[PDB]
Symmetry: C2
Subunit: 352 residues, 2 copies
Amino acid sequence: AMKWKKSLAGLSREEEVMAELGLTKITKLSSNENPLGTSKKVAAIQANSSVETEIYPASSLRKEVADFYQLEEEELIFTAGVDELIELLTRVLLDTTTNTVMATPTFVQYRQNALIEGAEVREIPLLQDGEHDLEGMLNAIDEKTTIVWICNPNNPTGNYIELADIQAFLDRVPSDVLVVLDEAYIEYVTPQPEKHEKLVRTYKNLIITRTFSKIYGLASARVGYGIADKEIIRQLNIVRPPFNTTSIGQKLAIEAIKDQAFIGECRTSNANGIKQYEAFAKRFEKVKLYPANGNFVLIDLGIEAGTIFSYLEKNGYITRSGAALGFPTAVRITIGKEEDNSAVIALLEKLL
Amino acid sequence: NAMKWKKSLAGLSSKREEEVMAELGLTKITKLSSNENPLGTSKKVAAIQANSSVETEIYASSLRKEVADFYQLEEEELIFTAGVDELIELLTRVLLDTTTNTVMATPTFVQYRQNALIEGAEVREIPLLQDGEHDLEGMLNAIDEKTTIVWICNPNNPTGNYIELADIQAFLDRVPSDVLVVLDEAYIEYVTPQPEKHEKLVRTYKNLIITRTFSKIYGLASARVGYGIADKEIIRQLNIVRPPFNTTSIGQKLAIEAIKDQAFIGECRTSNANGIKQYEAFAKRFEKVKLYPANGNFVLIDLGIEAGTIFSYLEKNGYITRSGAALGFPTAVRITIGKEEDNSAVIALLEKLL
């Protein structure tokens, strides 16, 4: 009987399944947390801390991160995961009288938060190869458009848009429209893009979002951050919640950005995992492998997503079903260690 | 040229231990500003923490069973949230926008108003009574066809006033069954005499959600865990909109244990009640002082001196408090009830200003 927003209609455990199947080792490959874990140096901090001194308070982390990207601390905002930043963005800019532009299928959290704020969502279907249709998205932009979202690399497809095409897009976008460049996966791209944190100085309507929850392997403690010019950061500050991270989460992230050697080796093992899946798609014509540039692959088998999900799961691999992702006959599989990529590929092959 | 920020943001406003204590040079400092249990956590909760490394997963079955059982509720009448603050934000996001209004007392917990403004709602803020009580009647008068939420903080932050259950009910009887009433009971475990159980009122008043936390009496500082109690319809709806982030594996473990440990709750409640008695002995001696009827674990003391001065005076003498300037009382401090000797030290300092 309550008077809930009408825009609301439009949105609508590991040990569990394992004891239900009589399986020993079950391998989880459904979330894109780094399967290799963290640095040894970051691991030593975790093992060194008791959740008995833990609290929600950092100059340390602001400074460390600003020094890493050669930026001003004034250009950073920290948040308890990038999901939280997405929430904040929508609360400050979206409403009944506004619209927002994004791709489908992309990360569900944009449309979810946009719909909760009562915004009109204009969703531009990917190109057939899985790319953002940057052209259609520019055409959708309006005087009522307040936010354009670019997921780069894309989740769930993996596609990556080169900087030159990001810059071309930003030139044409009106300067009073915020463009959120979601770079949750950027550390996985090979070869690595050139430094473009500074882009935010050129385009005063740009925010880049990044997280410690993927490659850094700290989805545990939840640290995400936004890079944007001062004016944007200051506005975002006014509206953040009473607490974010624990002082330990912050301690862990300081060490994470320092251990680039771990990120190097991860970036390379991941690219090898991806090569594994490519050999597989090249063997089987009827399979559709989207272009992978993060730490997951999206594979359309022409088999119902739920069936693929159960089959892999009943053989001891949890993956992310495509029916949740906008792909009724695909699954998204996180790239893990080589010996696990191999076993999933062997299982898929029997289907084909 | 700026981004197209919503206009409702204009009317929005805007760690201590180690930095402040060195940025002064005191031996130690005592924090009596945040209302988290200064006596800490139960010893069993403690033992779990001390035997648990910082390795921790995000994502509630054992917890909702354990809490549903402790209150004799159905599990589907509960929603769990990363602190009561998230629930407050959740509520405002499902029910408030530019075309709505919400009613609340003033001064009350600042987050009700904050989140209302962001969502763009009109906030009809009803002044507290002289005694610090909610002007319940004034709040009935302020309800409209466009009102979607009424907020009731009980016991109130920052005044401490408690509204008796039979009064709650008499108000809820008048409220349109169309308007969500949020009864914020973050401090309810400090009230003596302890109130009748009233969790099951949500079965009578289908427009009622009650909100509680593990952040005050339960002392959970590691974990941030809040929950609401409402009828299944309200929960079902709130479930749709909840963030993917919720709370740690260990946070949930810790709360399962915290709620089973009711001996600690009993000792704290009586120890807290003794602390309040001390402040009452103090107000009785000084007719100049205005002490509010405290039923949570803090006192609001109006000394007729600027909030900022009281705050400095206490801080520089080892005691961090909450300035009434942040809380709507330019001439008070809100002081958390701690150990007996800490309460004594604070009363003695205040007396020298008097």
